[PDB]
């Protein structure tokens, strides 16, 4: 399961954060700062994979804002990248031409979409249209 998923910008500002592991707030902040420093101090040919604290810290940002994942050492690495790409595509479809400005404005919607997509670090919606339809139906409820 994915221990934590956090959307951080290139300048260091974090646009998303979802940790599936219960940690102290100071410890969580320190871990996030260390992850940002490692990502901010990494090149473009580092393979986007880091084994930090025995955790598969996978970083792959498709724009200025980067994305990170932390899975245990028990599964394949390309699966995390595929899941990240699928989540990005689903978010773009739900929003429509997603940019950094809209991500901050749609933080609650982004959190709801992440909850409806992955729960507890495990994959919850394998299809891409069923999750979008469910999100639209939930939004239309009011």
């Amino acid at each position: 399961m994915i221990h934590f998923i956090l959307l951080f910008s290139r300048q260091g500002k974090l646009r998303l954060q979802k940790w599936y592991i219960t940690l102290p707030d100071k410890e969580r902040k320190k871990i996030t700062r260390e992850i940002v420093q490692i990502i901010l101090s990494r090149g473009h040919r580092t393979s986007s994979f880091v084994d930090w604290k025995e955790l598969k810290l996978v970083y792959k940002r498709y724009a200025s804002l980067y994305f990170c994942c932390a899975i245990e050492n028990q599964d394949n690495e390309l699966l995390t990248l595929e899941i990240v790409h699928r989540y990005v595509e689903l978010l773009d479809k739900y929003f429509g031409n997603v940019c950094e400005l809209d991500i901050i404005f749609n933080f609650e919607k982004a959190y709801f979409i992440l909850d409806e997509f992955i729960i507890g670090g495990e994959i919850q919606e394998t299809s891409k249209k069923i999750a979008v339809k469910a999100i639209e139906d939930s939004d239309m409820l009011q």
Binding site: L65, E89, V98, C99, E100
Partner: peptide, 10 residues
């Protein structure tokens, strides 16, 4: 800026 750009450009 660099923030209004699409995440995937699709």
């Amino acid at each position: 800026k660099g923030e209004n750009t699409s995440l995937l450009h699709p």
